[PDB]
Amino acid sequence: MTHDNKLQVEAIKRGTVIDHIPAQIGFKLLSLFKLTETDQRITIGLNLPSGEMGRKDLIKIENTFLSEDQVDQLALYAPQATVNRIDNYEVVGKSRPSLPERIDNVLVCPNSNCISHAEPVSSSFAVRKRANDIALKCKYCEKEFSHNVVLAN
């Protein structure tokens, strides 16, 4: 309990706030990373009027703390987000994402002869070469593609 309002909604006690999600990535992040599969209160602000992007998205998951590498799976989609860790109404932690070395599960190999399609295994990609533009290599078929290509489909 503290004043919410919604232009930049307020205060959960204890939990995570992922703020400065680009715009239209918020729901991708809920879908992809199954953040929704918790049983705690989640509050989400979509197309919001603020920080300079102008519009942005925001997700608040109370009582859950996600980090170190969870924050990093966010880097491909929401690299400029901040992940605030909150205890007792105070932001005891502000993190940002960084390119990890592995992105599990979330991607799909664009190589159609890859075995990964059919089987009870998770996708896995070795990540490399920061912000001049990321190459992703499948664990299984060892073909290396441009991230924008895997990310299209």
């Binding site: 664009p110 190589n111 159609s112 002869n113 073909k143 593609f145 441009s146 290509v149």
Partner: protein, 310 residues
């Protein structure tokens, strides 16, 4: 008697500008007043030694709409010829003995032209010979450019897709080079480039052409956008999918296309043109297929008829 009377329509390289215009002016009349009994009593053979449904159904419907009878076979479903060791010269010397014209598709290049050495006076019209020619696809394409653009010259035509192995982009470039001031834009992955012999022929006639890597660079100026399908056997799985698979048209890219721009595709289109394109005024691939009826009717009319009153 008209110039095409009793000719073999084997290659686009053999038809002149005047020949082209004659077929295209007849297609326009048959499309405007039907002549459903013009080829009454004529029997025509539809020999498709390699199957092609799209092309066969269209050639036979055109034969049916002028009143001819059709006998024939589709194969690679082992309908018995080729057996024992019957040469193609011998098959065509026996089929030629009772039909009035042979329409034929065959897998080897040159087969329609050889049929011509054995048919006596029965015209041979080629419906595809290996990777060489396909005149009746070029004729329907041209008819669709003329009918939608009003002309066949001073056109800005973009050819997109597999330009190296696509037998129809190679002939349409040769037919359009018969005409004036056309400008070509080729947009192809590096492995599927438009061959030198086409480019060399263009240079030698002083026709302008250029290579671009995005439809986006040229949308604005374009009149006819002829897309081709890439067959993923021509590349490998990962090559196909890699940054080279973006020769795909979506409705969003047409944003700034000229109001007269048309998208043409011989078909099957599998994914290079997305389903949402269909809703736009520019989608003309199916209307292009319907036009194959009047261009094939015109060739059968002109070839079997001395004089034609139009």
């Amino acid at each position: 008697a008209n110039p095409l009377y009793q000719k073999h329509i084997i290659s686009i390289n053999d038809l002149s500008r005047d020949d082209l215009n004659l077929v295209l002016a007849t297609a326009a009349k048959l499309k405007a007043n039907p002549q459903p009994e013009l080829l009454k009593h004529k029997v025509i053979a539809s020999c498709f030694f390699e199957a092609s449904t799209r092309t066969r159904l269209s050639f036979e419907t055109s034969m049916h709409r002028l009143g001819a009878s059709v006998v024939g076979f589709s194969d690679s479903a082992n309908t018995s010829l080729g057996k024992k060791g019957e040469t193609l010269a011998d098959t065509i010397s026996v089929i030629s003995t009772y039909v009035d014209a042979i329409v034929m598709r065959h897998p080897q290049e040159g087969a329609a032209r050889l049929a011509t050495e054995f048919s006596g006076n029965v015209p041979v019209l080629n419906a595809g010979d290996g990777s060489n020619q396909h005149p009746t696809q070029t004729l329907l394409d041209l008819f669709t450019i003329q009918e939608t653009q009003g002309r066949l010259d001073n056109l800005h035509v973009a050819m997109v897709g597999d330009l190296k192995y696509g037998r129809t982009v190679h002939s349409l470039t040769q037919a359009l080079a018969k005409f004036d001031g056309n400008r070509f834009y080729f947009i192809a992955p590096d492995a599927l480039a438009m061959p030198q012999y086409i480019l060399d022929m263009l240079d030698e006639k002083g026709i302008a052409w250029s290579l671009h890597s995005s439809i986006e660079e040229v949308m604005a100026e374009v009149d006819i956008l002829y897309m081709t399908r890439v067959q993923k056997e021509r590349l490998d799985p990962s090559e196909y999918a890699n940054v080279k698979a973006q020769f795909v048209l979506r409705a969003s890219d047409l944003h700034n296309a000229k109001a007269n721009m048309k998208v043409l595709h011989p078909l099957p289109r599998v994914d290079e043109i997305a389903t949402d394109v269909d809703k736009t005024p520019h989608a003309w691939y199916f209307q292009q297929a319907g036009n194959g009826i009047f261009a094939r009717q015109a060739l059968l009319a002109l070839v079997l008829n001395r004089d034609l009153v139009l």
